[PDB]
């Protein structure tokens, strides 16, 4: 039912890894009509600024992937701390 | 497979509403051990600041819901423009 249940719908993961994990979904649902790009990477940058302040993680561990569906674009930012 | 397919796994929605929709997932996976709260609403505030700049939407249309699972907390921000 919950989006989080969709994230955790692969049985129980259990096991302690002693690490924190951020799952950030930035989904912008638009249309075939559109213009003036630069929204997902704009917020991404801001999030990386906040990251640099509080969360010491390198882009070597941060997974950045954008997925396109029709006129909808979503940015996935997975952060391992 | 994709998180976006999980978001759009309820058949095809089609129908044009001539409106934009943002689906923001801010998921912080931690543990029973933890302290110094105030991360989800901190980013939420920052996002609302960016919203006020670029995206003219009122909290009357913005859905704000936090979901707790064990030592994991996720904040869902749904914005209708």
Q: How far apart are CA B78 and CA B81, in angstroms?
A: 10
Phi, psi of B35 (to 5 degrees): -170, 180
Contacts of B20 in chain A (CB under 8 A): 28-31
Alpha-carbon gap, residue A14 to A7, rounded angstroms = 14
Nearest Cα neighbor of A34 from A76, A68, A77 is A68
A55 contact B CB<8A: no
Judging contacts by C-beta atoms under 8 Å, the chain B residues touching residue A70 are none
Domains annotated on chain B, with CATH: 3-80 (3.30.1070.10)
**Structure tokens that stand for B6 in this block:** 């999980």
Let me know: does A40 contact A77? Beta carbons within 8 Å.
Answer: no
Tokens of B44: 């939420």
Q: For residue A60, which of A79, A42, A74, A40 has the smallest C-alpha distance?
A: A79
Cβ count near A73 (within 10 Å): 19
B55/A contact by beta carbon, under 8 A: no
**CA pair distance B45, B59, nearest whole angstrom:** 12
Cβ distance B4 to A74 less than 8 Å, yes or no, reads yes
N- to C-terminal Cα distance for chain B?
28
Name the residue among B19, B40, B28, B66 with its Cα closest to residue A80: B28
Neighbours of B61 (CB within 10 A): 11
Distance, in Å, from the CA atom of B61 to the CA atom of B79, rounded to the nearest integer, reads 7
Distance (Å) from the alpha carbon of A78 to chain B's nearest alpha carbon: 10
CA–CA distance, A59 with A80 (Å, rounded to integer): 10
**Cα A44 to the center of its chain, rounded Å:** 9
For testing contact with chain B, the best of A12, A17, A20 (most B CBs within 10 A): A20
Is B24 within 8 Å of A26 when comparing Cβ atoms? yes
Alpha-carbon separation of residue B32 from A15, B22, B25, B26, B72 (angstroms): 14, 31, 21, 19, 9
A27-56 core/surface letters (b: 16 or more CB in 10 A; e: else): bbbbeeeeeeeebbeebbeebbeebeeeee
Report how far residue A80's alpha carbon sits from residue A72's, in angstroms, rounded to the nearest whole number. Answer: 26
Backbone φ/ψ region at B77: left (φ over 0), alpha (ψ -120 to 50), beta? beta
Residues of chain A positioned with their CB less than 8 A from the CB of B47: 43
**CA–CA gap between residue A9 and residue B38 (Å, rounded):** 27
């Amino acid at each position: 039912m919950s989006l989080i249940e969709l994230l955790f719908g692969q049985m129980q993961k259990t096991a302690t890894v002693a690490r924190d994990r951020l799952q950030i979904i930035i989904a912008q649902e638009r249309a075939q009509e559109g213009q003036t790009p630069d929204y997902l990477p704009t917020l991404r940058k801001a999030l990386m600024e906040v990251l640099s302040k509080y969360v010491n993680v390198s882009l070597d561990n941060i997974r950045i992937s954008q997925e396109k569906q029709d006129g909808m674009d979503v940015l996935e930012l997975n952060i391992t701390l």
